[PDB]
Design a protein around this ligand. Structure first.
Ligand code: 5ID
Ligand code: NA
Length: 352
């Protein structure tokens, strides 16, 4: 009963005999994710097809994702069940990451129903419980948003796609005005368009800040066409930055842009969100600060009263050891990255 190559969309998904009955799950600026029947574990799983190697940048992102996910182990973080790839370096064209199948994502859920303050609260907790574990290893997701937040029928939640993940390092965070980035625009912290590369845990807190407002209204906050517009959507709600708040902002252009913007007063949350728990609104406020230095940490957030029903310090594991990368890897020929990916996946080879 051979066959293999079922194709999701119009691309091959060579994962059989183990898995068959493939079904496209969705996007992935990264790779393509499908669901399939695992014949040994006799259960349906999710399997992402990554096809890098022809782009050094993709190679980097794929290697980081793999290396991190292979080393992480946490309930609110998606693990890797197996990794399929060619037994020959030369013949390896893509990598197949087999992961536990989740029913939906937070984005699909927000589009289908209005969450109760109870659901909103529980998902925030979980997101933060995973965030704590991730930050403990000094890792930054940098692309937290509704789609990267998988959820099952039992309301379980686990963080997604670490393709843009990197290690903190606030030493090389300054970058200059209007220096672009890859992460999803609607969730970019304001300092991203002003003077930051997003190399500090504060970048993750803002995103979660956006996600909370989102679960509270079933709509982005902050959309933005339109880079920069994004910067203006934020100021629209936060109001014009405080003096010393800048300021903190010595970047000629950044400081002048902000200066040329018509004064705008902050919009009370309880105003843009009438009928939402005050406890939740207070946390949000502390997550969406214009200044990254004043932004609430992942730990104080979990300790915030709105999560008091879930907060439990002896049941929110932390990373055993921090992580660090090259050291050269950023500037390295994509082929040498193919070897690292071929080595990192070695242990899953039914053979070598
Ligand atoms: N294990 C899983 N179960 C179900 N869906 C999954 C996963 C994984 I890994 C990713 N996705 C969905 O695919 C989208 C693109 O990354 C993500 O936004 C998400 O929609
Ligand atoms: Na994923």
């Amino acid at each position: 009963v051979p066959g293999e190559v079922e194709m999701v969309k119009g691309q091959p998904f060579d994962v059989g005999p183990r898995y068959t009955q493939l079904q496209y799950i969705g996007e992935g600026a990264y790779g393509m994710v499908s669901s399939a029947y695992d014949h040994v574990r006799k259960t349906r799983v999710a399997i992402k097809k990554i096809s890098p190697f022809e782009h050094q940048t993709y190679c980097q992102r794929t290697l980081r994702e793999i290396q991190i996910l292979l080393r992480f182990r946490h309930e609110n973080v998606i693990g890797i069940r197996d990794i399929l790839r060619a037994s020959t370096l030369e013949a390896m064209r893509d990598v197949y990451i087999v992961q536990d199948l989740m029913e939906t994502d937070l984005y699909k859920l927000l589009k289908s129903q209005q969450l109760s303050n109870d659901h909103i609260c529980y998902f925030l907790y979980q997101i933060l419980r995973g965030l704590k574990y991730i930050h403990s290893a000094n890792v930054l997701h940098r692309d937290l948003k509704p789609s990267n937040l998988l959820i099952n029928t039992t309301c379980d939640l686990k963080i997604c796609d670490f393709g843009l993940a990197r290690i903190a390092d606030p030493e090389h965070d300054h970058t200059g005005f209007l220096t672009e980035y890859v992460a999803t625009r609607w969730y970019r912290a304001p300092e991203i368009m002003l003077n930051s590369k997003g190399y500090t845990k504060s970048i993750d807190i803002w995103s979660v800040g956006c996600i909370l407002a989102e679960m509270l209204s079933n709509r982005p906050i902050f959309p933005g066409k339109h880079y920069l517009d994004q910067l203006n959507h934020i100021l629209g709600i936060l109001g014009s930055p405080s003096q010393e708040d800048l300021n903190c902002i010595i970047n000629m252009k950044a400081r002048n842009y902000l200066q040329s913007l018509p004064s705008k007063t902050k919009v009370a949350w309880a105003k843009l969100f009438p009928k939402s728990d005050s406890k939740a609104l207070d946390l949000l406020d502390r997550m969406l600060t214009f200044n990254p230095n004043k932004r609430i940490t992942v730990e104080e957030a979990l300790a915030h009263p709105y999560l008091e029903q879930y907060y439990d310090p002896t049941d929110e594991p932390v990373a055993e050891e921090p992580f660090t990368f090259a050291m050269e890897l950023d500037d390295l020929p994509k082929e040498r990255l193919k070897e690292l990916i071929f080595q990192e996946t070695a242990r899953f080879q039914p053979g070598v």
